[PDB]
Design goal:
The structure is cut from a larger assembly and holds 6 copies of chain A. Helices cover 74% and strands 0% of the residues of chain A. Chain A is elongated and about 60 Å long. The longest helix of chain A is centred in the last third of the chain and has 32 residues, at 124-155. The first copy, chain A, contains 5 helices and no strands. In chain A, α1 (11-38) packs antiparallel against α2, α3 (93-120) packs antiparallel against α4 (124-155) and α4 packs across α5 (161-172). Chains A, B, C, D, E, F: Fe cation 1 binds at residues 24, 59, 62.
């Protein structure tokens, strides 16, 4: 039953990787929803839409890299349903950025727990995989989203549609 | 409540588009599963894996184009859960190709029903959208998959692992 | 007696590095033997030979990088005899690939023990050296060898000399 | 009070980063002093001066990267006075190189303690930041300085002004 | 005791140069603090940050040129502690620009006193050094900062976060 | 049992080739030891290290060419243990060069005996292989090492660390 390549790869780590794959696919779907919200004719913030579509594709890439990891270690991928995002209508550029920040922090928390598990199972390859490919990416993403939220708020979002317009132009464009 | 851009776009068409979006996202996820099945160390068919990953990304592109359509017409996207694929283990190159063929034919059937609905609602824009972007693509995909299945079977798949090996090299590589 | 550069470098880590150097040199020599086995006129698999010669040189590079590490930390290299490989005749492409897989897993196990020792001695530089330069390399090498073994077996190696011939051409060539 | 981006970043780590920033700025200032010592008309070792000025600028870069880290994690930078270096007159090329070696080892010790703290607080992002950007840099710097000191001593520094002259020309030039 | 190169270089001028070196290093450190204030996630004015970092590096260059002068004339550099800046939190883009203006005017006043001293000691080389490299630079810097402050105030800084946002984009970007 | 390609290739020649392969691998390992001796922080002669590493790789190439010969003639390679070098610490640039000279002369003596054996067995292919690829190489290597030893001695090695320093720079650099 054991893969010929498997070495020092605990069942708990394999299961946690499968959960992280699902979470990354979920994040990609959340960002897809946000993108096309901003593509609505009654929202019409093209650069918000582009920003979130880029994030969606990046999240898909993260999921695929985890799947590649799983196969590299000799674990077996078990996919689950990708739940629909919590919202259909993201209300505003600022609200979407705040939800993105919350999402990225949740993903980061899951990654930190994954690292803790790897450490407990003395899986240095897994630990360094997470460190190299995920944790700094997450820190950067959180910092960027926080900067965006700060700017929107200082500009007067979401009540100032001019605020969101100019942010779309000058920051995201 | 009605979008300022909406014109000659029936509620039934909007709902059918939302269903097609979900179906395309589902197909993308199926192909993703197949790709990483072939990436397993105990399967190890790199070009099968590449082929199905390409298909996965293409299906995502199809879904996004439908979302763009929905917004263009002034309908509203409502996302649903993306169900996990029917299999974790796709058994063989031939079996995966046959399942892909079945999937593509199901997608085609859904597209044909969408066209029929558009026609019944006298929505020529929608009809020609489907015709231009989807129906021929589907016909081509089905023909290609049928050709692949035919070749694998004639070569002796799935019992001839040499068969699948050489198909991976010479057709998909 | 203590090197002017030495800092946070335990005697046990220094000794373990010397053992790893010997192991890497041993692996290089094993791969050299395999390469020239496939260079025999009665075996005559040029691409197997090339593959294993490449691996031999890579293993030498790994050993030299460990020697460089040893000097960087202010430890002292102590070389030992390089034992001859366990076989003169590697029997088949498949058998050689399986022995290579076993060898790479043994090297990986030694690296994991080295990492555990470094961690126990709170030597983060050493830990990250191992993580960055060795562990992922090992995981990749094991995955690649497992893929090769899987393909050869599915093709019908080692009884199908046609199998090995075509693998030599299409995978290793 | 808590930054919107802050996650898994302990107050003790934040304080330790602020201390490391100060230490890096101090090291930059030490190297600046050494550089301009060698720029004196009665010392006149241009390549020593260039070497230490380069080191000064590199140390400033290290400090700024730590400040960037601090902001990325949502900690707050608190700057302190930069103490003047211990010497105005560095006596000789050899003496300056030895003091540089001592300084680099002190910086390394502080980094190791920072890593230990990060580990104790289960801050893998911080650990890997230190590992990736600082620890190997330090090991290299210490090895290089030790090599320089060894060469100067073997050449006959500091009594052989010819020794320092030729080292300036051939190693540092 | 007297340097072989020293000619027409009064002890008072040497001491005043040492004081100016310290002041330039202090200004560099002030600008560094301001830069990383604007790098905070809750401030998030990237172009303010870049502007002040550039100023910090320029101030370092000014200090190093004074050190070079000191050695050229045969004076001896005596470094002092670099005091921490007066603020940790610079409150706003406008407030930081006003503090920068005040700082630059203080530096200018010190330079003017240095010139007066040089003149009194009949040190035309020193006078022209100051004139050529420092005084016009200061005048320009003060004029630029005054222009910035004027614009921010007219735009509605610091209460209009939109004001600072657009200034960051259009003037400093 | 006899290889299909074997012609005019005596068992004694085959055995002597296997011994020469081992000797070449041994020489490679000796040079590797010397290289990393000079890489020590307390020796720190980078160009000595580079010179000996180059020699190590060249010796490995010689061994591989002999293995290729063995297979070309239809003999069978039998590898033996590679003994560790006689020294861990090579004491000085001059001492290492003298040991290298002794080693190269021993290798040359073995080659001359190999040629004599080939001649006695009327194996002109083997004789000319040795002549073309090995004997002149050896003569050159011995002459070069003798020149190096002569220069070091005249310069005052090994007591003059300046001597070795300048030789490292000007001859080996
Ligand atoms: Mg074929
Ligand atoms: Mg790491
Ligand atoms: Na992600
Ligand atoms: Na499709
Ligand atoms: Na290795
Ligand atoms: Na540093
Ligand atoms: Na200045
Ligand atoms: Na040789």
């Amino acid at each position: 039953s054991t893969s010929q390549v498997r070495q020092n790869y605990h069942q708990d780590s394999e299961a946690a990787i499968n959960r992280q794959i699902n979470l990354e696919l979920y994040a990609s779907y959340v960002y897809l929803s946000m993108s096309y919200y901003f593509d609505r004719d009654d929202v019409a913030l093209k650069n918000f839409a582009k920003y979130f579509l880029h994030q969606s594709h990046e999240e898909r890439e993260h999921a695929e890299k985890l799947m590649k990891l799983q196969n590299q270690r000799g674990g077996r991928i078990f996919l689950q349903d990708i739940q629909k995002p919590d919202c259909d209508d993201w209300e505003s550029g600022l609200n979407a950025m705040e939800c993105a920040l919350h999402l990225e922090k949740n993903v980061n928390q899951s990654l930190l727990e994954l690292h803790k598990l790897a450490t407990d199972k003395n899986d240095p390859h897994l630990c360094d995989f997470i460190e190299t490919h995920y944790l700094n990416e997450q820190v950067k993403a959180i910092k960027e989203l926080g900067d965006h939220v700060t700017n929107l708020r200082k500009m007067g979002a979401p009540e100032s549609g001019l605020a969101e317009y100019l942010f779309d132009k000058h920051t995201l464009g």
